[PDB]
Ligand binder design. Structure first.
Ligand code: NI
Length: 145
Protein backbone atom coordinates (compact mmCIF):
# COMPACT_ATOMS: atom_id res chain seq x y z
CA UNK A 1 0.00 0.00 0.00
CA UNK A 2 0.96 3.64 -0.10
CA UNK A 3 2.18 5.05 3.23
CA UNK A 4 2.12 8.84 3.07
CA UNK A 5 3.40 9.53 6.55
CA UNK A 6 0.66 8.20 8.89
CA UNK A 7 -1.87 7.83 6.08
CA UNK A 8 -2.25 4.41 4.47
CA UNK A 9 -3.83 4.50 1.02
CA UNK A 10 -5.18 1.13 -0.13
CA UNK A 11 -7.54 1.72 -3.14
CA UNK A 12 -4.93 2.35 -5.93
CA UNK A 13 -1.41 1.10 -6.80
CA UNK A 14 1.27 2.67 -8.99
CA UNK A 15 0.65 0.27 -11.97
CA UNK A 16 -2.88 1.68 -12.26
CA UNK A 17 -1.66 5.31 -12.13
CA UNK A 18 1.08 4.71 -14.70
CA UNK A 19 -1.16 2.92 -17.21
CA UNK A 20 -3.78 5.71 -16.85
CA UNK A 21 -1.10 8.36 -17.33
CA UNK A 22 0.37 6.82 -20.46
CA UNK A 23 -3.09 6.78 -22.12
CA UNK A 24 -3.62 10.53 -21.20
CA UNK A 25 -0.07 11.49 -22.32
CA UNK A 26 -0.68 9.79 -25.67
CA UNK A 27 -3.49 12.34 -26.33
CA UNK A 28 -1.42 15.42 -25.37
CA UNK A 29 9.14 22.67 -14.73
CA UNK A 30 6.17 23.47 -12.44
CA UNK A 31 6.98 20.45 -10.23
CA UNK A 32 10.59 20.39 -9.11
CA UNK A 33 11.65 16.70 -8.79
CA UNK A 34 14.67 17.72 -6.66
CA UNK A 35 12.35 19.51 -4.21
CA UNK A 36 9.87 16.63 -4.04
CA UNK A 37 12.80 14.12 -3.43
CA UNK A 38 13.64 15.74 -0.04
CA UNK A 39 10.02 15.88 1.29
CA UNK A 40 9.84 14.00 4.62
CA UNK A 41 7.61 10.96 5.12
CA UNK A 42 5.58 13.01 7.62
CA UNK A 43 5.00 15.95 5.18
CA UNK A 44 4.01 13.66 2.32
CA UNK A 45 0.37 13.24 3.45
CA UNK A 46 -0.28 16.98 3.34
CA UNK A 47 1.60 17.62 0.10
CA UNK A 48 0.23 14.69 -1.94
CA UNK A 49 -3.29 15.66 -0.82
CA UNK A 50 -2.77 19.34 -1.73
CA UNK A 51 -1.32 18.51 -5.17
CA UNK A 52 -3.94 15.92 -6.08
CA UNK A 53 -6.71 18.33 -4.97
CA UNK A 54 -5.16 21.01 -7.21
CA UNK A 55 -5.12 18.61 -10.18
CA UNK A 56 -8.76 17.61 -9.53
CA UNK A 57 -10.04 21.16 -8.88
CA UNK A 58 -7.93 23.33 -11.24
CA UNK A 59 -5.89 21.30 -13.75
CA UNK A 60 -8.43 18.88 -15.27
CA UNK A 61 -11.10 21.59 -15.23
CA UNK A 62 -8.93 24.01 -17.24
CA UNK A 63 -7.71 21.44 -19.79
CA UNK A 64 -10.20 22.11 -22.59
CA UNK A 65 -9.17 19.29 -24.95
CA UNK A 66 -10.27 16.44 -22.57
CA UNK A 67 -13.74 16.58 -24.23
CA UNK A 68 -12.44 16.34 -27.84
CA UNK A 69 -13.91 12.83 -28.31
CA UNK A 70 -15.32 10.19 -25.98
CA UNK A 71 -12.19 7.93 -25.82
CA UNK A 72 -10.10 10.96 -24.79
CA UNK A 73 -12.61 11.94 -22.11
CA UNK A 74 -12.59 8.33 -20.84
CA UNK A 75 -8.77 8.31 -20.58
CA UNK A 76 -8.74 11.56 -18.59
CA UNK A 77 -11.61 10.27 -16.43
CA UNK A 78 -9.75 7.07 -15.56
CA UNK A 79 -6.75 9.10 -14.38
CA UNK A 80 -8.91 11.54 -12.36
CA UNK A 81 -10.76 8.57 -10.80
CA UNK A 82 -7.43 7.18 -9.58
CA UNK A 83 -6.57 10.54 -8.00
CA UNK A 84 -9.99 10.67 -6.31
CA UNK A 85 -9.56 7.22 -4.86
CA UNK A 86 -6.22 8.31 -3.30
CA UNK A 87 -7.68 11.58 -1.94
CA UNK A 88 -10.64 9.60 -0.48
CA UNK A 89 -8.13 8.03 1.97
CA UNK A 90 -5.93 11.17 2.49
CA UNK A 91 -8.85 13.54 3.30
CA UNK A 92 -9.91 11.57 6.44
CA UNK A 93 -6.24 11.50 7.61
CA UNK A 94 -6.26 15.28 7.38
CA UNK A 95 -9.73 15.69 9.08
CA UNK A 96 -8.62 13.37 11.96
CA UNK A 97 -5.58 15.71 12.34
CA UNK A 98 -3.15 12.88 11.42
CA UNK A 99 -1.03 14.78 8.79
CA UNK A 100 1.51 17.52 9.68
CA UNK A 101 1.78 20.69 7.51
CA UNK A 102 4.71 22.76 8.77
CA UNK A 103 5.19 26.21 7.27
CA UNK A 104 7.99 24.81 4.96
CA UNK A 105 5.47 22.31 3.54
CA UNK A 106 2.87 24.97 2.68
CA UNK A 107 5.66 27.02 1.05
CA UNK A 108 6.62 24.09 -1.21
CA UNK A 109 3.01 23.90 -2.45
CA UNK A 110 2.99 27.71 -2.95
CA UNK A 111 6.17 27.39 -5.11
CA UNK A 112 4.22 25.03 -7.39
CA UNK A 113 1.13 27.25 -7.45
CA UNK A 114 3.16 30.41 -8.23
CA UNK A 115 4.78 28.61 -11.21
CA UNK A 116 1.41 27.32 -12.44
CA UNK A 117 -0.16 30.77 -12.25
CA UNK A 118 2.67 32.40 -14.38
CA UNK A 119 1.13 30.89 -17.50
CA UNK A 120 -2.25 31.32 -19.12
CA UNK A 121 -4.41 28.76 -17.30
CA UNK A 122 -5.06 26.50 -20.32
CA UNK A 123 -1.32 26.36 -21.13
CA UNK A 124 -0.61 25.81 -17.41
CA UNK A 125 -3.11 22.94 -17.28
CA UNK A 126 -1.55 21.32 -20.38
CA UNK A 127 1.93 21.64 -18.87
CA UNK A 128 0.81 20.25 -15.47
CA UNK A 129 -0.79 17.20 -17.12
CA UNK A 130 2.46 16.49 -18.96
CA UNK A 131 4.30 16.61 -15.59
CA UNK A 132 2.19 13.85 -14.04
CA UNK A 133 5.16 11.51 -14.59
CA UNK A 134 7.17 13.68 -12.14
CA UNK A 135 4.30 13.48 -9.66
CA UNK A 136 3.89 9.68 -9.99
CA UNK A 137 7.65 8.94 -9.78
CA UNK A 138 7.65 10.85 -6.48
CA UNK A 139 4.42 9.27 -5.17
CA UNK A 140 5.57 5.74 -5.83
CA UNK A 141 8.50 6.29 -3.36
CA UNK A 142 5.78 5.92 -0.73
CA UNK A 143 4.39 2.65 -2.18
CA UNK A 144 5.50 -0.52 -0.37
CA UNK A 145 4.88 -4.20 -1.03
NI1 NI B 1 -0.11 23.54 8.30
Amino acid sequence: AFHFGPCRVEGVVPQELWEAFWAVRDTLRLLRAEVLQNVSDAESCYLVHQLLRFYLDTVFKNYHNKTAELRTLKSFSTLANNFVLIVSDLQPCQEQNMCSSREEAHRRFLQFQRAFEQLDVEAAATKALGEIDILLRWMQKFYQL
